Design an enzyme around this catalytic site. Structure first.
Site, PDB file in Angstrom:
ATOM      1  N   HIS B  40       0.729 -35.181  27.093  1.00  0.00           N
ATOM      2  CA  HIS B  40       2.056 -35.746  27.383  1.00  0.00           C
ATOM      3  C   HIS B  40       2.323 -35.933  28.877  1.00  0.00           C
ATOM      4  O   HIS B  40       3.384 -36.444  29.252  1.00  0.00           O
ATOM      5  CB  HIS B  40       3.162 -34.919  26.692  1.00  0.00           C
ATOM      6  CG  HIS B  40       3.443 -33.588  27.302  1.00  0.00           C
ATOM      7  ND1 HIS B  40       3.010 -32.414  26.725  1.00  0.00           N
ATOM      8  CD2 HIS B  40       4.174 -33.227  28.381  1.00  0.00           C
ATOM      9  CE1 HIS B  40       3.442 -31.389  27.439  1.00  0.00           C
ATOM     10  NE2 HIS B  40       4.145 -31.853  28.452  1.00  0.00           N
ATOM     11  N   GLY B 142       7.534 -28.067  33.928  1.00  0.00           N
ATOM     12  CA  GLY B 142       6.454 -28.046  34.886  1.00  0.00           C
ATOM     13  C   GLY B 142       5.337 -27.078  34.553  1.00  0.00           C
ATOM     14  O   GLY B 142       4.282 -27.128  35.197  1.00  0.00           O
ATOM     15  N   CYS B 144       3.582 -26.800  31.710  1.00  0.00           N
ATOM     16  CA  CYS B 144       2.572 -27.205  30.741  1.00  0.00           C
ATOM     17  C   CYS B 144       1.209 -27.329  31.418  1.00  0.00           C
ATOM     18  O   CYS B 144       1.100 -27.663  32.593  1.00  0.00           O
ATOM     19  CB  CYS B 144       2.959 -28.507  30.064  1.00  0.00           C
ATOM     20  SG  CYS B 144       4.287 -28.218  28.878  1.00  0.00           S
TER      21      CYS B 144
HETATM   22  C1  LIG Z   1       5.683 -28.808  29.854  1.00  0.00           C
HETATM   23  O1  LIG Z   1       5.571 -30.193  30.058  1.00  0.00           O
HETATM   24  C2  LIG Z   1       6.988 -28.573  29.097  1.00  0.00           C
HETATM   25  C3  LIG Z   1       7.292 -27.064  28.922  1.00  0.00           C
HETATM   26  C4  LIG Z   1       8.644 -26.810  28.152  1.00  0.00           C
HETATM   27  C5  LIG Z   1       9.727 -27.209  28.876  1.00  0.00           C
HETATM   28  C6  LIG Z   1      10.860 -26.152  28.619  1.00  0.00           C
HETATM   29  N1  LIG Z   1      10.114 -24.884  28.102  1.00  0.00           N
HETATM   30  C7  LIG Z   1       8.823 -25.251  27.834  1.00  0.00           C
HETATM   31  O2  LIG Z   1       7.977 -24.519  27.418  1.00  0.00           O
HETATM   32  N2  LIG Z   1       6.918 -29.177  27.791  1.00  0.00           N
HETATM   33  C8  LIG Z   1       7.857 -30.208  27.398  1.00  0.00           C
HETATM   34  O3  LIG Z   1       8.728 -30.592  28.130  1.00  0.00           O
HETATM   35  C9  LIG Z   1       7.669 -30.752  25.975  1.00  0.00           C
HETATM   36  C10 LIG Z   1       7.073 -32.127  26.003  1.00  0.00           C
HETATM   37  C11 LIG Z   1       7.002 -32.739  24.575  1.00  0.00           C
HETATM   38  C12 LIG Z   1       6.432 -34.183  24.663  1.00  0.00           C
HETATM   39  C13 LIG Z   1       6.180 -31.863  23.587  1.00  0.00           C
HETATM   40  N3  LIG Z   1       8.975 -30.768  25.349  1.00  0.00           N
HETATM   41  C14 LIG Z   1       9.543 -29.511  24.845  1.00  0.00           C
HETATM   42  O4  LIG Z   1       9.000 -28.457  24.957  1.00  0.00           O
HETATM   43  O5  LIG Z   1      10.795 -29.660  24.190  1.00  0.00           O
HETATM   44  C15 LIG Z   1      11.642 -28.496  24.139  1.00  0.00           C
HETATM   45  C16 LIG Z   1      12.401 -28.606  22.785  1.00  0.00           C
HETATM   46  C17 LIG Z   1      13.308 -27.391  22.649  1.00  0.00           C
HETATM   47  C18 LIG Z   1      14.114 -27.457  21.348  1.00  0.00           C
HETATM   48  C19 LIG Z   1      14.964 -28.724  21.328  1.00  0.00           C
HETATM   49  C20 LIG Z   1      15.720 -28.830  19.973  1.00  0.00           C
HETATM   50  C21 LIG Z   1      16.902 -27.783  19.880  1.00  0.00           C
HETATM   51  C22 LIG Z   1      17.829 -28.064  18.637  1.00  0.00           C
HETATM   52  C23 LIG Z   1      14.147 -29.998  21.538  1.00  0.00           C
HETATM   53  C24 LIG Z   1      13.151 -29.930  22.716  1.00  0.00           C
END
Ligand SMILES: *[C@@H](O)[C@H](C[C@@H]1CCNC1=O)NC(=O)[C@H](CC(C)C)NC(=O)OC[C@H]1CC[C@H](CCC)CC1
Ligand SMILES: *[C@@H](O)[C@H](C[C@@H]1CCNC1=O)NC(=O)[C@H](CC(C)C)NC(=O)OC[C@H]1CC[C@H](CCC)CC1
Lengths: 300, 300
Positions: B40, B142, B144
């Site tokens: 991603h 940041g 990931c």
């Molecule tokens: C690394 O890029 C990042 C790490 C996340 C950010 C916040 N805590 C972490 O571990 N990963 C992301 O941003 C992913 C990217 C997608 C394309 C898989 N997104 C993500 O982790 O989304 C967080 C979810 C939390 C729960 C929310 C629904 C709540 C009703 C939706 C998003």
């Protein structure tokens, strides 16, 4: 979403060596052309109860200290005792010496421990220097000379060297000038630390961490005053909360929109009522080994 | 005298790089002439809800991946997608590549996480792969591409790469072949892990650790059977204890002189009665993120 986290240990791993005198082996810290280690490496088992370190050290020469870095022997060309540490001058500067300083850490502050045996790193974990100048570590025979440190920028601030265990199972040691934290002496007898008071400002910081991470059940509709909060703090062997502590919590207060004295009112209720089977950041006890800085660093 | 301890992180620190695509930056793992990172990185914010990764990746060329190791740019000379990871071939082998393997870890096992941002290590902590294939980490935007690993001998076994957070605040990610642990997909929607069952064999290991370290108030005069213990385990969403688990606990049983089924009788009582304000190894909850091996390694 909030964890007890140690600093990355690579810079310190490169400084660890093994020091042997006779059959006694422990760890040393190799910085520039000096190896620092606990002076009780010169003790045999018959010495550890009441050692006369000055007399014991006079019987030792440079060649009685075996210093091993990996599989490589270092040549000891001088030795001296500074408080409870030995400084062994060796003929090679450690090529991996990081930028570093020695600091004497204040009670209530935290640091990472790199636990080592036979000069080899075993694991890393975070500790606080408790108000009674003990730490709650994990140390076995052979672990002495393991160090505690913080990393700030690229600079390693060494603050702790491990020497001993107390009857209560907690741990005591020195700064890198060889001066013990607390009243302890390096002899193998029962020693008391006194009352283990709780670091109030850290508990409040951790409650702010809980709010940031979505755990808010303990927030109530009350506020209190500093003097009224401290009357309850005292009963539970909490450090008196001072205005200096309130100032240190200012940034977390503004980040969460919860006034410090409102959070004190919540802490007061938790102390008097308990948690009624609930948890905060995965804990059923109030945690006091995160500083305000630790919380901000982690949540950023 | 018993702590949650991570492995020394030096060998892994030397493998961390920064990977940027457009405005999206995360961490990569640089081993030999390949950089591994979450796919991603190719997403913008408008892509993250329902990305078509195949279509998004076709629009990217080698020169759209900026890989930075320290202050030094690496030249990307090939790229491919394997499950949920990208493999960026670069023109320089990492000179710090350790001896390593990729392993897919079993639920109930533990590993260390080196949390990183912008290719720079931030901290280290221990996690378990939970039965529902989530981990309880500390990760921000940041983070990931941060990895989990074990060290065995001089060999680093990489088992986890971080990708996302769930609504419950726990974390999900992949092995280094890019296959998620658990049912998760790398899209920014709410996903369920299901019931978070407790790792029974680990709780028993930690009770043995407590006995070793002098905490014995919970030992009673009773024994039980496996089937009778499991009737109580079920009610508390504990994993059924199997004979294989009993065999794994054999060495701790012999070390302490407490039969496994006697310790199960103690656990049964703790589950039904609680701890009545008492603590075990400094905890007011039953801890399940130490394996039997973790306990033996630490207490040795
Ligand atoms: C690394 O890029 C990042 C790490 C996340 C950010 C916040 N805590 C972490 O571990 N990963 C992301 O941003 C992913 C990217 C997608 C394309 C898989 N997104 C993500 O982790 O989304 C967080 C979810 C939390 C729960 C929310 C629904 C709540 C009703 C939706 C998003
Ligand atoms: C490192 O050399 C080693 C580390 C100890 C061993 C066990 N846990 C540790 O942290 N340090 C020692 O062996 C010191 C050496 C002396 C010369 C300071 N000895 C020590 O720590 O003694 C342990 C005490 C425990 C409490 C006991 C009294 C109980 C009523 C006496 C000894």
């Amino acid at each position: 979403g909030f964890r007890k986290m140690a600093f990355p240990s690579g810079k310190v791993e490169g400084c660890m060596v093994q020091v042997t005198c006779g059959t006694t082996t422990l760890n040393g810290l190799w910085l520039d052309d000096v190896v620092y280690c606990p002076r009780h490496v010169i003790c045999t088992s018959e010495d550890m109860l009441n050692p006369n370190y000055e007399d014991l050290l006079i019987r030792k020469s440079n060649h009685n200290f075996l210093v091993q870095a990996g599989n490589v022997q270092l040549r000891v060309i001088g030795h001296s005792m500074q408080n409870c540490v030995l400084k062994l001058k060796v003929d090679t500067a450690n090529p991996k010496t990081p930028k570093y300083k020695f600091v004497r850490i204040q009670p209530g502050q935290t640091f990472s421990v790199l636990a080592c045996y036979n000069g080899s790193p075993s694991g890393v974990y975070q500790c606080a220097m408790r108000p009674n100048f003990t730490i709650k570590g994990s140390f076995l025979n052979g672990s002495c000379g393991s160090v505690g440190f913080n990393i700030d920028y690229d600079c390693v601030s060494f603050c702790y060297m491990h020497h001993m265990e107390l009857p209560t199972g907690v741990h005591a040691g020195t700064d890198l000038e060889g001066n013990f934290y607390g009243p302890f002496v390096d002899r193998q007898t029962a020693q008391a630390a006194g009352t283990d008071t709780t670091i109030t400002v850290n508990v409040l910081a951790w409650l702010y961490a809980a709010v940031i991470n979505g755990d808010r059940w303990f927030l109530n509709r009350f506020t209190t005053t500093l003097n009224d909060f401290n009357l309850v703090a005292m009963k539970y062997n909490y450090e008196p909360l001072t205005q200096d502590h309130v100032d240190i919590l200012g940034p977390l207060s503004a980040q969460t929109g919860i006034a410090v004295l409102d959070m004190c009112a919540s802490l007061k209720e938790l102390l008097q009522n308990g948690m009624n089977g609930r948890t905060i950041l995965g804990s059923a006890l109030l945690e006091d080994e995160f500083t305000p800085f630790d919380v901000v660093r982690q949540c950023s």
